[PDB]
Write a protein that binds this DNA or RNA. Structure first.
Ligand SMILES: NCCCC#Cc1cn([C@H]2C[C@H](O)[C@@H](COP(=O)(O)OP(=O)(O)OP(=O)(O)O)O2)c2ncnc(N)c12
Ligand SMILES: [Cl-]
Ligand SMILES: [Cl-]
Ligand SMILES: [Mg+2]
Ligand SMILES: [Mg+2]
Ligand SMILES: [Mg+2]
Length: 539
DNA sequence: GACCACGGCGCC
DNA sequence: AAATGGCGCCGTGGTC
């Protein structure tokens, strides 16, 4: 392309180079734009940002987040990544998308700008005739990228002092556990090494191996294996406790306080829009979609996520979302009726599991039942089921047959979904998001059946994903108008931050928006809480 | 220092 | 571990 002076004309596509992948932490090393057979390179990248009306191009959101960081209201616009991702969600990297749709991802801003231009042209062409994918792009993905940009640049507050103090307490308990483990082994070793631990458990001590690892076929020391060996030796329980503590300390307690941004004094994640096979977002650097909540220490960590002074967190979470979605997709009357009657399948399963009345079910019991309900739905084997419930095989098997015989059209929907996936090569969500699953026609049964579970899960998980995205796009402008902030999405959950005076009003509005987003054959219900911290807000 | 595969495990 | 699905990050062991 012909080189020309900065600035570019309106509608130009941008290319840019960051010192590191995370836009909140990156230095903008270079910036360029391309349009009409010209490439414009900015002599001073930061100042040049002011000349752009929007960020249009590959990884648009990243540039937008950096702009917002610098106090510039630069929204993201067209991004070829989003087009490619809709065409085929295995399109997750600019490297792959460039190669596939007409160019090469290099380290020069001008070349990236030019690449962005031609990829958009090509990919736009590929979306012609694809009306449903076009709808998702214009009505969901493109607007959502703006929403996510604001969320990333906003961040969430963390009680750093609290976490620092907690680290010290946890360190001392870890020391007690490791000392016991070493005593019981008869000698010290690296307890963080599963290879060393395998030899201690299975070679040095008497313990029977139960399972093997996938890639290298070592004797597994996974939590599943250790639970089964709980009554074989006292060292086992000590290791399980050591694992829990060290996992939480190494992954959350210690790293996160070090990631507070110096300017904002908050913790900023990345919400990746082209990262999953089903249409879910992912979160990284750090991942804020896997903050602990199940165990006592886990809850203590989640409590570190707090509202700004004078504000409150609002947490909203769709009730039994994929089950409701399944009712709609399958059209099973029986299942639809369950939700019309305001029943809770997780609580009911839980009451069965632990053999207690529905009122006796505590949250942790209900949570346990989720794994069982979704596990069975998406193809769990009777054997594992019996195993994880520690009930005889016959009972487990019996539960799965009743599970489905209760809901006739569910199996029918699955069969229909797979048959259609085999013919077309892909399956799709309610709104037409696609996932290609070529292994539906695999001649190896284990490979084929794995593919089948991936395939019939996607429309359900993906539709739920679509619904949340649509809800975020609708909700965002309403929140802006109320002076509230959207902070995090955790798949079927949103966490907002509102001024105390308005927190109650915001919760009600957000609840109604989420419930009314796209009516199905069954009501959508959203549970909402308000609190000074994430844990409090969910209770 | 950075990458990697692996086993493992946090969440949804 | 096992015929649930979807993610990202940890330390280890290893290479470069
Ligand atoms: N906090 C949940 C911890 C255990 C779990 C879970 C799982 C959650 N999902 C998927 C299905 C669910 O609708 C969705 C939302 O997660 P969710 O909100 O935990 O589950 P839910 O909304 O059904 O129940 P609730 O009324 O409490 O919101 O994530 C799953 N899909 C496949 N296998 C699994 N084990 C799970
Ligand atoms: Cl950093
Ligand atoms: Cl839960
Ligand atoms: Mg939910
Ligand atoms: Mg949830
Ligand atoms: Mg892995």
């Amino acid at each position: 392309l012909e080189e020309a002076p900065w600035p570019p004309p309106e509608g130009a596509f941008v290319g840019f180079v960051l010192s590191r992948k995370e836009p909140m932490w990156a230095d903008l090393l270079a910036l360029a734009a391309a349009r009409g057979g010209r490439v414009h390179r900015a002599p001073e990248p930061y100042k040049a940002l002011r000349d752009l009306k929007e960020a249009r191009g590959l990884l648009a959101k990243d540039l937008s987040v950096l702009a917002l960081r610098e106090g510039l209201g630069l929204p993201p616009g067209d991004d070829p990544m989003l087009l490619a991702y809709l065409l085929d969600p295995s399109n997750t990297t600019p490297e792959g998308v460039a190669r596939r749709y007409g160019g090469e991802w290099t380290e020069e801003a001008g070349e990236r700008a030019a690449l962005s231009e031609r990829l958009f042209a090509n990919l736009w062409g590929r979306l012609e005739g694809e009306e449903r994918l076009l709808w998702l792009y214009r009505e969901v993905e493109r607007p959502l990228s703006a929403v996510l940009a604001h969320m990333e640049a906003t961040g969430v507050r963390l009680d750093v002092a609290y976490l620092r103090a907690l680290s010290l307490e946890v360190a001392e308990e870890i020391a007690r556990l490791e000392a016991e483990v070493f005593r019981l082994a008869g000698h010290p070793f690296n307890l963080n090494s599963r290879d060393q631990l395998e030899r201690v458990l299975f070679d040095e001590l008497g313990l029977p191996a139960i399972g093997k690892t996938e890639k290298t076929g070592k004797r597994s020391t996974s939590a599943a294996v250790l639970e089964a060996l709980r009554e074989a030796h006292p060292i086992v329980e000590k290791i399980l406790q050591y694992r829990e503590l060290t996992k939480l300390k190494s992954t959350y307690i210690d790293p996160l306080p070090d990631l507070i941004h110096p300017r904002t004094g908050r913790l900023h994640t990345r919400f990746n829009q082209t990262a999953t096979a089903t249409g879910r977002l992912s979160s990284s650097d750090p991942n804020l979609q896997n903050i602990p909540v199940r165990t006592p220490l886990g809850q203590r960590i989640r409590r570190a996520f707090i509202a700004e002074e004078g504000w409150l967190l609002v947490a909203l979470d769709y009730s039994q979302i994929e089950l409701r979605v399944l009712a709609h997709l399958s059209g099973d009357e029986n299942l639809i009726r369950v939700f019309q009657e305001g029943r809770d399948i997780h609580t009911e399963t839980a009451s069965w599991m632990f053999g207690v009345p529905r009122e006796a079910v505590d949250p942790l019991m209900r949570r346990a039942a989720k794994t069982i309900n979704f596990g069975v739905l998406y193809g769990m084997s009777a054997h594992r089921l019996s195993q994880e419930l520690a009930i005889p095989y016959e009972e487990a098997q019996a539960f799965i047959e009743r599970y489905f015989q209760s809901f006739p059209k569910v199996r029918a929907w699955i069969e229909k979904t797979l048959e259609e996936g085999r013919r077309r090569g892909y399956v799709e969500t309610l709104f037409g998001r696609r996932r290609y699953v070529p292994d539906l026609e695999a001649r190896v049964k284990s490979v084929r059946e794995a593919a089948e579970r991936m395939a019939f899960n996607m429309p359900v998980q993906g539709t739920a994903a679509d619904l949340m995205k649509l809800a975020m796009v609708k909700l965002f402008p309403r929140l802006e108008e109320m002076g509230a902030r959207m902070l995090l999405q955790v798949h079927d959950e949103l966490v907002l931050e509102a001024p105390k005076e308005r927190a109650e009003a915001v919760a009600r509005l957000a609840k109604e928006v989420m419930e009314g987003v796209y009516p199905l054959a069954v009501p959508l219900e959203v549970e909402v809480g308000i609190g000074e911290d994430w844990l409090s807000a969910k209770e």
